[PDB]
Structure formats: C-alpha cells, structure tokens
Structure 1
Amino acid sequence: MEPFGTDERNWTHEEKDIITRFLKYDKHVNLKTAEMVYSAEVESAYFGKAGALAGGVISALFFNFPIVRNLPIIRRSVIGVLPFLYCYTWGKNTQEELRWLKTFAAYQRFVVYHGQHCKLWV
C-alpha cells in the first residue's frame, strides 16, 4: 500500500508508530492480526532492558579491569562505559527490529486481508 523501489523513502519513526497503533486499535483489522502485534510488543520489550542490564554489569567489571583500573579517570571512565553503550544500543536495536519485523508482517497480513496489493489475489 506504499511506494516500492530504491528511490522511495524508508519508513519513518512516526509512520511506524502510526501504523502499529492502527493495527492495534483499528476496527477493520482482524483478531489474529491484532494478536500478532500484541505478541510482538510483549515478547520484544524484554530485550530493551535485558541488553541495558547486561551492559551495566559488563561496564562495571570493565571499569575495574586490569588496565582500565590503572588508567586516569578521563580515559578510565570513557573506556569503561563502552561495553554499556554497545550493549545498550544492541538491546534497543534488537527490540525495535523484532517489534518492527512482526508488525510489518501484520501489516502484510492486513493488506492481503483487505486486498490492497495490486498483485495479490486468490
């Protein structure tokens, strides 16, 4: 139901938020499609905080690591926080990817359900 091609514009954050809300609370969607979106939210929220928590523990260890500990604070803090940043972004990136991929799959199911694809029919 959207433009296709390399020259087109990739999905924006606002567009994704509107579509996922549309799938969740719109009447024209079917129950199975709505359940798919709901399952994606619950099953994806874990990674957002799991990655952050894992990063903090690793960063705390890395702050006291053999070399990081003896470095000056300016270098010690910056080097010691890198594992947290890598894990924090990894958790957020995987959460959004998991939620978006299943939400996009629900969007595909909705389009086929209402026959809004110009090259799909029974």
Structure 2
Amino acid sequence: MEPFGTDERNWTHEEKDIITRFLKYDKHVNLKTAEMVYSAEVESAYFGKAGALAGGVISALFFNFPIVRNLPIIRRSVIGVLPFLYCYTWGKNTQEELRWLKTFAAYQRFVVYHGQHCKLWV
C-alpha cells in the first residue's frame, strides 16, 4: 500500500503504530493475521524489559569493577551508566524490531487477503 522505492520516505514510528492498531482490530483483517499480530505483540514485550533489567544488573557490577573502584565520581558514574544504556537500547531495539517485522508481515498478509499488491495475480 505504501510507496516503494529508494527515494521514498521510510515508514514513521507513528505510522507504524497506527498500522499496528488498524491490524489489531480491523473488521476486514482475517483471523489468522489477527492471531499472528496478537502473538507478536504479546511475546515482544519481554525482550525490552529483560534487556533493561540486564543493563541494570550488569551496570551495577561494572560500577564496582577493579579500576572502576577508585576513579573520580563523574567518570565512575559515566562508566557505570554506559552498560545500562547499551543493554536497555539493545532490549528496546529487539522488542521494536520483532514487533515491527511481524507487523509488516501481517500487513503483507492482509494485502494478500485483499490483493492490494501490484503484479500479484493468482
């Protein structure tokens, strides 16, 4: 449905949210696509929270590491927060990637259910 091409603008975050919401409750979306979307939304939540918790855990140990023990407060805080940010970003990116990929797959399936793709003839 959306434009395809290198020059075309990439799908936005708000657009992706709107598309996911439409696919979640549309009366013109098949039950298989709905179940796929629900399963995608359910399981993708654990990854981000788990990554954030892993960052919180690992960053605490890195705050009391051998060389981290006797550094100035600013450098110690920065070094400690460094692992937490990396792991939180990893978890959130993984969750968003899984959700958006499955959403795009569901969108393709719905377009197929309505034949909304050019040169797609059965």
* Counterpart in the other structure of 1:22: 22
Q: Tell me the C-alpha RMSD between the 2 structures.
A: 0.5
Shift of 1:119: 1.2
Unaligned runs of 5+ in 1: none
**1:55-75 deviations in whole A, cap 9, x for unaligned?**
011000000000111101110
**How far did residue 98 of structure 1 move?**
0.3
Q: Distance in 1 between matches of 2:7 and 2:20?
A: 24
How far off its partner does 1:31 sit? 0.4
Which runs of no fewer than 5 residues in structure 2 stay unpaired?
A: none
Partners of 1:9 and 1:120 in 2: how far apart? Answer: 23
1:35-83 deviation digits (Å, cap 9, x = unpaired):
1110001110001100000001100000000011110111000011100
Paired with 1:74 and 1:83, the residues of 2 have a C-alpha distance of: 15
Distance 1:69 1:47 in 2: 31
Distance in 2, matches of 1:101 and 1:56, equals 27
4+ residue runs over 3 A deviation: none
**Structure 2 SS opposite 1:69:** helix
The alignment's TM-score, normalised by the length of structure 1, stands at 0.98
In the alignment, the residues of structure 2 paired with residue 105 and residue 54 of structure 1 have an alpha-carbon distance, to the nearest angstrom, of 29
Q: Give me the whole-angstrom Cα distance separating, in 1, the residues matched to 2:88 and 2:69.
A: 22
Identity of aligned residues (%): 100
Could you tell me how far apart the structure 2 residues matched to 1:102 and 1:114 are?
18
Distance in 1 (alpha carbons) for counterparts of 2:68 and 2:30: 55
In structure 1, the partner of 2:104 is 104
- CA positional deviation for 1:97: 0.2
How far off its partner does 1:116 sit? 0.6
